[PDB]
Amino acid sequence: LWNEGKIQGKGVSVIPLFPRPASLDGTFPGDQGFDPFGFSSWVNMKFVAEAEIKHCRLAMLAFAGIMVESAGISFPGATSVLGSSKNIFEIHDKAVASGAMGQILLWVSFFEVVAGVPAMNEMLNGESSRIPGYYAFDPLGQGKGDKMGRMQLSEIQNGRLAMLAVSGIVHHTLITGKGPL
Amino acid sequence: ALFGKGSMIVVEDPRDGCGAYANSGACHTFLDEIGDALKK
Amino acid sequence: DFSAAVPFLKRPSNLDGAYIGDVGFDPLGFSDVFDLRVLREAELKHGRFAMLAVLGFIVQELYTFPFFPKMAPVDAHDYFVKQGGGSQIIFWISFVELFGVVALFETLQGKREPGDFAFDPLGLAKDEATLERYRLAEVKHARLAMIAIGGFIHQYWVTKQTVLEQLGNF
Amino acid sequence: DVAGLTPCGESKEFARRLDGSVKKLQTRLSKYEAGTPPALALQKQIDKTKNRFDRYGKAGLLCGTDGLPHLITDGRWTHSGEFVIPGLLFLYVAGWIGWVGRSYVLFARTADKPTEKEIIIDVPVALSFVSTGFIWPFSAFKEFTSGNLIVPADEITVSPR
Amino acid sequence: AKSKAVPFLSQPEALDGSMAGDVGFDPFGISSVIDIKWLRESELKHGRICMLAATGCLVQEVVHLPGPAFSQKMALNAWAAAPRGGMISILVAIGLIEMISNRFALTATDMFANPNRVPGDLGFDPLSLGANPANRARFELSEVIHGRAAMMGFSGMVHQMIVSKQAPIEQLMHFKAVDSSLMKLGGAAGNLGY
Amino acid sequence: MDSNFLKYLSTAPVLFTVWLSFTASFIIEANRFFPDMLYFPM
Numbered sequence: 001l002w003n004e005g006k007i008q009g010k011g012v013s014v015i016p017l018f019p020r021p022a023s024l025d026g027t028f029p030g031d032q033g034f035d036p037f038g039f040s041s042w043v044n045m046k047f048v049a050e051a052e053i054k055h056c057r058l059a060m061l062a063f064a065g066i067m068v069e070s071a072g073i074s075f076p077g078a079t080s081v082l083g084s085s086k087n088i089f090e091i092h093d094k095a096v097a098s099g100a101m102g103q104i105l106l107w108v109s110f111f112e113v114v115a116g117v118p119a120m121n122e123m124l125n126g127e128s129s130r131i132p133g134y135y136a137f138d139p140l141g142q143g144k145g146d147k148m149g150r151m152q153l154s155e156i157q158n159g160r161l162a163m164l165a166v167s168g169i170v171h172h173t174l175i176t177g178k179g180p181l
Numbered sequence: 182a183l184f185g186k187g188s189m190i191v192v193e194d195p196r197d198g199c200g201a202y203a204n205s206g207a208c209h210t211f212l213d214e215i216g217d218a219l220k221k
Numbered sequence: 222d223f224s225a226a227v228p229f230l231k232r233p234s235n236l237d238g239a240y241i242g243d244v245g246f247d248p249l250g251f252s253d254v255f256d257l258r259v260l261r262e263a264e265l266k267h268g269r270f271a272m273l274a275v276l277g278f279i280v281q282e283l284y285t286f287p288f289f290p291k292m293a294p295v296d297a298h299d300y301f302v303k304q305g306g307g308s309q310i311i312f313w314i315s316f317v318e319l320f321g322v323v324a325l326f327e328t329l330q331g332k333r334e335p336g337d338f339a340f341d342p343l344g345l346a347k348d349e350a351t352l353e354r355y356r357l358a359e360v361k362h363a364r365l366a367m368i369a370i371g372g373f374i375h376q377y378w379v380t381k382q383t384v385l386e387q388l389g390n391f
Numbered sequence: 392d393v394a395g396l397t398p399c400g401e402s403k404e405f406a407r408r409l410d411g412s413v414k415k416l417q418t419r420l421s422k423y424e425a426g427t428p429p430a431l432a433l434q435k436q437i438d439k440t441k442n443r444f445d446r447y448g449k450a451g452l453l454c455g456t457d458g459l460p461h462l463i464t465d466g467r468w469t470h471s472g473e474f475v476i477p478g479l480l481f482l483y484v485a486g487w488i489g490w491v492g493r494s495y496v497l498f499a500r501t502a503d504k505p506t507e508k509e510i511i512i513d514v515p516v517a518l519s520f521v522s523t524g525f526i527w528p529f530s531a532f533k534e535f536t537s538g539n540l541i542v543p544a545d546e547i548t549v550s551p552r
Numbered sequence: 553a554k555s556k557a558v559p560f561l562s563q564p565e566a567l568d569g570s571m572a573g574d575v576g577f578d579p580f581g582i583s584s585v586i587d588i589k590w591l592r593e594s595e596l597k598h599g600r601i602c603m604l605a606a607t608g609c610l611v612q613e614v615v616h617l618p619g620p621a622f623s624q625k626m627a628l629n630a631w632a633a634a635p636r637g638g639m640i641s642i643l644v645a646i647g648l649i650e651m652i653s654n655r656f657a658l659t660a661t662d663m664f665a666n667p668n669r670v671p672g673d674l675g676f677d678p679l680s681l682g683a684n685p686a687n688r689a690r691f692e693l694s695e696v697i698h699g700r701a702a703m704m705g706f707s708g709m710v711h712q713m714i715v716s717k718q719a720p721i722e723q724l725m726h727f728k729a730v731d732s733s734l735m736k737l738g739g740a741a742g743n744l745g746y
Numbered sequence: 747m748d749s750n751f752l753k754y755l756s757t758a759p760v761l762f763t764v765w766l767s768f769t770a771s772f773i774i775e776a777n778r779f780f781p782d783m784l785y786f787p788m
């Protein structure tokens with residue numbers, strides 16, 4: 001859940017080497033110390049929270065995409081038009097050349113301008129009281145108490161791990177020439 | 182409609198039929214120049 | 222009273238512990254003649270240039286950018302005089318130094334510490350005590366790097382070997 | 392052509408002027424080696440001399456018997472670029488300078504010390520005036536017709552006679 | 553009381569955060585010498601000109617009016633190719649626009665003579681897009697910001713057309729690096745002339 | 747910058763020397779890039 005005081009709260013440090021700053025408030029889902037360079041002092045906390053959740057969600061989805069495309073798993077006929085390789089880099093370059101990446105770019109950017117930018121503008125202006133990262137996207141239930149509680153903390157930690165792991169995977173593929181799995 | 186079949190608006194494509202990155206031949210984009218410098 | 226650094230030299234009298242790093246060393250008495258705010262601005266500016274320069278050497282032997290040719294830092298000065306990137310660096314430094322001229326007018330007009338540009342992006346300075354120790358460390362490093370700079374450039378001239386390779390050889 | 396003059400592009404005396412001017416430079420160039428700084432300096436002067444003579448020949452200037460360009464200033468439109476247009480350009484700048492200087496002397500009269508404004512110029516206000524000069528023909532004529540350019544004869548000090 | 557843009561300088565007077573795009577940036581202290589009303593008039597005008605000019609360069613690369621006189625992808629070449637009579641028509645029309653839209657209050661001593669006159673506000677809202685007073689502050693901010701960005705962008709595009717004799721989009725798509733064997737800066741006095 | 751030093755630079759001889767040096771300087775530059783203009787080109 002929250003575990004305020006235990007984990008993700010005031011008096012919570014991931015690395016007590018760095019003292020927990022005062023400017024870092026204790027009400028943002030995922031706040032467990034870790035503000036060395038003092039960014040929370042001057043950045044908009046709502047903006048950086050939304051940016052963190054969005055970086056988290058891309059990292060998770062990209063990790064899933066890397067795993068599927070490095071295990072050889074595909075959709076029917078995808079390997080027919082695209083390459084047969086499992087190099088994530090090679091697939092990206094050939095799916096760009098196929099137009100598939102252009103279609104994903106088109107539709108992501110459409111959602112991100114017609115919905116993402118107004119949502120960001122209102123969440124930071126103070127016209128809607130939308131918590132960061134919220135898009136009312138809960139089709140398969142699993143909300144209620146969990147939605148504002150453990151799931152927010154589970155999401156943010158799985159996302160931070162996904163960011164670190166995705167960066168790891170791409171750089172391992174770079175330095176080796178062989179991907180994972 | 183102010184523009185007739187003769188003397189019609191000319192709409193060209195400045196992309197010249199190639200992509201942003203990883204081009205080959207007589208087409209070397211700015212992103213390709215960044216890739217060329219980083220690998221040298 | 223007597224100078225803290227040189228026991229037998231009298232204290233200059235324009236150096237009364239006002240600035241951090243003050244050990245009373247001013248035999249020529251340039252502070253009896255010239256404004257100490259101007260002198261401290263120059264001290265920190267010369268020292269920051271020297272610190273960036275000594276690191277500039279060390280990194281430039283260890284690594285150089287792939288798009289630029291590998292060569293020694295003095296050879297880099299001459300190459301970038303004739304190549305165009307030297308004028309780039311000179312222009313952008315001069316651009317910043319315009320607002321530095323405004324900054325020095327603000328210092329002369331009493332409203333700014335001599336080397337303070339409010340440049341603390343990483344929030345390293347926490348409160349008054351750590352900031353005083355940090356600026357003492359900055360002054361000491363700045364003076365030391367000024368000395369260091371002379372050594373790397375002059376030693377390269379006398380013996381045509383780079384600083385790390387000169388430690389490695391001989 | 393006009394006044395028995397010859398277009399400089401077909402004047403033979405203009406042609407000999409260009410040749411003599413280049414022979415004079417080429418014999419100075421004959422005393423230097425190819426890549427020297429005195430050779431490049433003179434080779435750039437031979438290029439400049441030829442360019443000037445080429446431009447004058449193709450400009451519609453008229454040459455005399457002496458092979459030098461002559462200016463026609465009677466008002467004809469085929470020759471307006473020699474006096475009438477340079478003159479129109481001059482009078483615009485001259486009236487600008489006059490309008491701007493006049494505007495500042497009137498400002499300085501309403502000052503705390505009017506003569507200190509003329510040896511120590513209020514540069515932000517004097518620059519406000521210099522920018523205003525671009526429409527001096529309209530500003531000065533409206534000044535005239537609104538009775539603010541000319542002062543009447545009875546507010547001007549004159550000698551007793 | 554320090555500037556927000558330049559934290560080590562004092563916040564300039566005549567800059568009080570009222571104007572759109574005001575962040576405290578005036579290190580050279582021009583606002584203390586020149587009235588901020590004239591400066592904002594000139595900033596909005598320079599920015600509006602440059603928005604059109606930057607768009608002019610890019611669209612002129614892509615889309616042309618018919619005819620050989622309008623077939624210049626490189627925008628700096630269009631200056632010479634475009635019919636002179638019509639180019640001077642544009643210039644004369646601009647001058648007529650300048651006198652009428654300013655209502656004969658053109659100069660440094662008579663623009664803003666009317667206390668109703670506002671910097672940059674010429675009464676130009678043909679489609680009444682600024683009718684909503686809720687959008688007013690963010691329109692003013694984003695007009696100023698678009699203007700500043702386009703000043704910088706057009707300046708870059710012009711001098712990249714000078715360096716590279718290429719139109720801006722196809723300079724990005726057919727990039728060539730600066731050799732430095734040409735277009736060296738300065739030097740008129742280094743070689744003592746010539 | 748000092749206001750008494752700016753009041754010194756606003757004195758008539760300094761402004762006269764600066765303005766006519768600036769004025770002389772763009773005539774010199776205009777004759778460097780565009781030399782030998784005996785006529786308005788038309």
Ligand code: CLA
Pocket residue numbers: 057058060061063064065067068131132133134135136137138141142143146147148151152153154155158
């Ligand atoms: C472990 C991942 C994880 C977790 C715990 C959460 C948790 C949450 N999300 Mg987030 N989200 C995630 C991933 C996650 N999300 C990703 C990747 C996306 C992009 C698709 C989103 C997009 C998203 C939006 C747009 C919104 C939320 C919202 C929410 C909240 C309510 C929804 C909920 O509780 O259902 C979560 C239920 C589950 C996580 C059940 C598990 C389902 C699993 C993860 C699917 C696995 C797919 C597949 C099997 C991959 C594995 C194989 C692969 C390795 C090959 C809650 C805080 C809403 C909110 O209020 O935000 C504040 C909201 O508006 N999320």
Ligand code: CLA
Pocket residue numbers: 488489490491492493495512517518520521
């Ligand atoms: C801009 C200011 C200004 C203006 C509008 C005039 C206007 C006039 N003067 Mg001049 N005059 C001026 C300055 C000015 N004067 C100065 C500074 C001097 C001292 C050299 C004179 C000496 C002078 C003489 C001796 C004569 C005139 C005459 C005239 C009349 C005819 C035009 C002429 O002959 O110009 C001639 C102009 C000059 C000989 C010198 C002008 C020198 C410069 C270019 C002008 C000053 C610029 C000034 C610094 C402006 C700074 C503005 C800034 C602060 C905003 C006209 C009344 C003549 C007259 O009475 O005929 C009816 C005449 O005989 N004036």
Ligand code: CLA
Pocket residue numbers: 634635636637638639641642645
């Ligand atoms: C007094 C009115 C007037 C008259 C009689 C003319 C007459 C002429 N103009 Mg000119 N023009 C005028 C006003 C006028 N112009 C103004 C006020 C402007 C400035 C905005 C221009 C700008 C202009 C240019 C840039 C060009 C001409 C050209 C021409 C000539 C050929 C016209 C042609 O073939 O049209 C028939 C063709 C058309 C009607 C095609 C029209 C194309 C569209 C409508 C242009 C889009 C307008 C654009 C959105 C501008 C918006 C800004 C504006 C509202 C301020 C002809 C001599 C051309 C020329 O010199 O040819 C040698 C030329 O290139 N004109």
Ligand SMILES: CCCCCCCCCCCCCCCC(=O)OC[C@H](COP(=O)(O)OC[C@@H](O)CO)OC(=O)CCCCCCCCCCCCCCC
Pocket residue numbers: 308312737738739740741742743
């Ligand atoms: C708000 C707008 C900001 C604008 C920023 C300006 C960006 C470009 C500025 C130059 C870029 C790099 C220059 C390196 C290029 C460089 O330094 O070349 C060097 C050149 C002199 O030539 P040298 O003596 O160096 O010759 C050296 C030999 O190696 C070759 O012969 O310096 C100049 O005088 C050229 C500039 C003209 C000086 C007068 C300019 C006009 C005066 C107008 C009034 C003052 C305006 C400001 C004057 C500074």
Ligand SMILES: CC1=C(C#C/C(C)=C/C=C/C(C)=C/C=C/C=C(C)/C=C/C=C(\C)C#CC2=C(C)C[C@@H](O)CC2(C)C)C(C)(C)C[C@H](O)C1
Pocket residue numbers: 272273275276340341342343344345346361362363365366368369370371372373376384387388
């Ligand atoms: C301030 C600021 C920031 C920052 C920053 C930066 C870039 C800080 C960088 C600081 C640097 C580069 C300090 C370097 C000092 C060098 C010295 C004292 C020289 C030592 C050499 C010696 C003693 C020698 C020697 C010798 C001679 C001469 C020749 C040899 O043959 C022999 C030998 C080797 C013995 C950041 C952005 C992080 C944010 C923050 O919020 C505010």
Ligand SMILES: CC1=C(C#C/C(C)=C/C=C/C(C)=C/C=C/C=C(C)/C=C/C=C(\C)C#CC2=C(C)C[C@@H](O)CC2(C)C)C(C)(C)C[C@H](O)C1
Pocket residue numbers: 188597600601604617618619620621622638642646649650653
């Ligand atoms: C005043 C000022 C401002 C400003 C400004 C600026 C910079 C304004 C610039 C405006 C411009 C560039 C206007 C251009 C108009 C072009 C026209 C009408 C073309 C007509 C073509 C014709 C008639 C044709 C033809 C044909 C011919 C002859 C033969 C065929 O073979 C070809 C063809 C079929 C095409 C602003 C608003 C920014 C701010 C502030 O308030 C101050």
Ligand SMILES: CC1=C(C#C/C(C)=C/C=C/C(C)=C/C=C/C=C(C)/C=C/C=C(\C)C#CC2=C(C)C[C@@H](O)CC2(C)C)C(C)(C)C[C@H](O)C1
Pocket residue numbers: 603604606607676677678679680681682697698699701702704705706707708709712720721723724
């Ligand atoms: C107000 C009003 C209305 C209106 C209207 C109008 C006409 C509105 C139009 C507004 C426009 C045209 C805005 C354009 C802004 C352009 C910008 C910010 C570009 C910046 C470029 C950059 C940063 C760059 C760059 C570049 C560099 C140098 C390197 C290059 O190699 C490439 C690259 C391109 C990348 C109407 C008339 C409807 C009525 C209404 O009632 C009132």
Ligand SMILES: CC1=C(C#C/C(C)=C/C=C/C(C)=C/C=C/C=C(C)/C=C/C=C(C)/C=C/C2=C(C)CCCC2(C)C)C(C)(C)C[C@H](O)C1
Pocket residue numbers: 295298299367368370371372374375
């Ligand atoms: C020209 C040019 C170049 C260049 C260059 C450069 C920058 C060359 C460097 C010049 C410099 C920085 C010389 C300074 C050396 C420091 C000294 C002598 C201090 C000694 C300390 C002393 C004496 C005593 C210390 C004392 C003792 C006793 C102990 C107590 C403490 C103390 C009292 C302080 C390039 C590279 C750009 C190339 C280009 O093509 C041409």
